[PDB]
Design a binder for this molecule. Structure first.
Ligand SMILES: [Ca+2]
Lengths: 165, 263
């Protein structure tokens, strides 16, 4: 029925129940309990020691709980990665998502983690973006030039990069 | 058994790269078979075992606690942090970090643990003090997987790794409690399925830790044996190959099949 994928991830919406998530991601690809508590963790194709994945968080453990956090690694490819060390250094704490994108390239990032601590309210939303340079991204192997940019309420709180030139 | 060496030589010819191999008797520590035993290879995630070994050492001395909670934040996250990313808001204990580091190869978990012991340099110091003057950790996750040809940073030698693994698992270095904890985490390894485990006969015991990196670097360290009890340490590393992950996983499994066959 196909492993976890980028389209499935995007298809999944905040507010959905576990059943809705499972039916879209495909039960066989997911798991709960253990190291993931009551979140639902689904795997995609092999990627090094593990696989590409998505982890969905819920408001509570109940069966009627709703998705309040979406996280993923190696499921979404950047559409047009143009990040560079120079461009990364031009990013500054306090920028809005729009301003950051204008700095690192409109198609350099994918969403790594999105969480609404007060779901259904959007207040306090934290967002982590993983951005890549021309060849930084890879859905299987290690990144070759990437960056982590995180915000709260659409405002950049911090940044960090690896192997950007 | 020599038939295994035939498979190892075959693997080198297949991947077009060096393949280090060690088969040690758990009890005696004698070498049962070896190939390029003193050739250096990138440790990759296999170092996570040595890391939690140093961590356990501190717990024994009471300088560290298994339930000591660590609160990290976004700045600490590095690529491939499935467990630590999930507990970002809750935090994790030292015990949970080692479980994540070894059983899931969580990269952030490893860095945090490295932080609790003083960084790479300290792990190396730990290794030197227990008699291993070869194995060295120099960088943090994810840079330590660069595997630059001829670069000795973050590398080990098959023989040095097998011997060290034996010391951590059966030596008096760690308390019986820590040894058991280390072996248990390795037994719970859930990200090494396509390797040795794929040839393991039902009822056999295996505690392992695999690793993968750039330049076709691949590896696995393990303690296995029939009838639910370990009796030999096995170490396998390869690097430099252009082969695909599947091909490299295949060659390693085949070596394992041979090893199991002529046990
Ligand atoms: Ca690059």
């Amino acid at each position: 029925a196909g492993v976890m994928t980028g389209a499935k991830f995007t298809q999944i919406q905040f507010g959905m129940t576990r059943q809705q998530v499972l039916d879209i991601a495909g039960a066989e690809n997911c798991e709960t309990g253990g190291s993931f508590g009551d979140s639902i963790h689904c795997r995609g194709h092999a990627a090094g020691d593990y696989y590409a994945y998505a982890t969905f968080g819920f408001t509570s453990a109940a069966a009627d709980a709703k998705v309040d956090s979406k996280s993923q690694e190696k499921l979404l490819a950047p559409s047009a990665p143009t990040l560079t060390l120079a461009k990364f250094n031009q990013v500054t704490v306090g920028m809005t998502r729009a301003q950051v994108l204008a700095t690192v390239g409109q198609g350099s990032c994918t969403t790594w983690s999105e969480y609404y601590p007060a779901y259904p309210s959007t207040a306090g939303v934290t967002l982590s973006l993983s951005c890549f340079d021309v060849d930084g991204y890879s859905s299987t192997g290690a990144y070759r030039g990437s960056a982590h940019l995180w915000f709260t309420d659409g405002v950049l709180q911090g940044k960090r990069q690896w192997d950007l030139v | 058994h020599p038939e295994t060496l035939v498979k190892v030589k075959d693997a080198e010819d297949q991947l077009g790269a060096r393949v280090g191999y060690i088969e040690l008797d758990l009890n005696s520590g004698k070498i049962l078979e070896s190939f390029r035993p003193e050739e250096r290879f990138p440790m990759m995630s296999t170092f996570k075992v040595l890391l939690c070994g140093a961590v356990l050492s501190r717990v024994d001395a009471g300088q560290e606690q298994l339930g000591r909670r660590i609160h990290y934040s976004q700045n600490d996250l590095v690529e491939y942090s499935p467990v630590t990313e999930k507990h970002l808001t809750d935090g994790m204990t030292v015990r949970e970090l080692c479980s994540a580091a070894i059983t899931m190869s969580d990269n952030t978990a490893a860095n945090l643990l490295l932080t609790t012991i003083g960084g790479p340099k300290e792990l190396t110091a730990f290794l030197h003090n227990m008699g291993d003057h070869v194995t060295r950790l120099d960088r943090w996750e994810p840079e330590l997987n660069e595997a630059i040809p001829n670069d000795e940073r973050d590398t080990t030698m098959p023989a040095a790794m097998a011997t060290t693994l034996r010391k951590l698992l059966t030596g008096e270095l760690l308390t019986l409690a820590s040894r058991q904890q280390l072996i248990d985490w390795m037994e719970a390894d859930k990200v090494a399925g396509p390797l040795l485990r794929s040839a393991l006969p039902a009822g056999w015991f295996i505690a392992d830790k695999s690793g993968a990196g750039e330049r076709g670097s691949r590896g696995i360290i393990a303690a296995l044996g029939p009838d639910g009890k370990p009796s030999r340490i096995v170490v396998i590393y390869t690097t430099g190959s252009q082969a695909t992950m599947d091909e490299r996983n295949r060659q390693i499994a085949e070596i394992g099949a041979s090893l199991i066959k002529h046990w």
